[PDB]
Write a protein that binds this ligand. Structure first.
Ligand SMILES: [Mg+2]
Length: 59
RNA sequence: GCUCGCUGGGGAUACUGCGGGCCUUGGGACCGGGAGAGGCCGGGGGUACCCCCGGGGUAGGGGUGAAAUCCUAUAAUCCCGGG
């Protein structure tokens, strides 16, 4: 039954804000889309703009 | 010699005391550019920690030299969003 519970969940794609490019930053699972609101994701500036210098900047 | 103590007079003016004058070195007052977790009062913050509410997940967590009391299915330890 535990496995069955895990099968009810759908995966949602997370996008960066408009002025940062709006690119895809990841995927998160949930059964009800209302539970996705107010979740937070941490990404480095190197992930958005490719440069091996600003790897220590976290957004 | 001892009772080193008292008293009538004369002389000296280096030091101490007293009176007058004149100083700036000790001390104090004031002005300049700086130093400091010195003190008091008002405002704005930093992580950490404890409790409460909502989501996830499920059988352990904590603690000692070794254990046990203790906490946990009225859902803990752990992770996330708020107060
Ligand atoms: Mg809960």
């Amino acid at each position: 039954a535990a496995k069955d519970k895990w099968k009810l969940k759908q995966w949602y794609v997370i996008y960066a804000p408009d002025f940062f490019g709006g690119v895809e930053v990841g995927l998160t699972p949930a059964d009800d889309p209302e539970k996705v609101l107010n979740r937070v994701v941490e990404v480095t500036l190197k992930d958005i703009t490719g440069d091996f210098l600003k790897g220590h900047v976290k957004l």
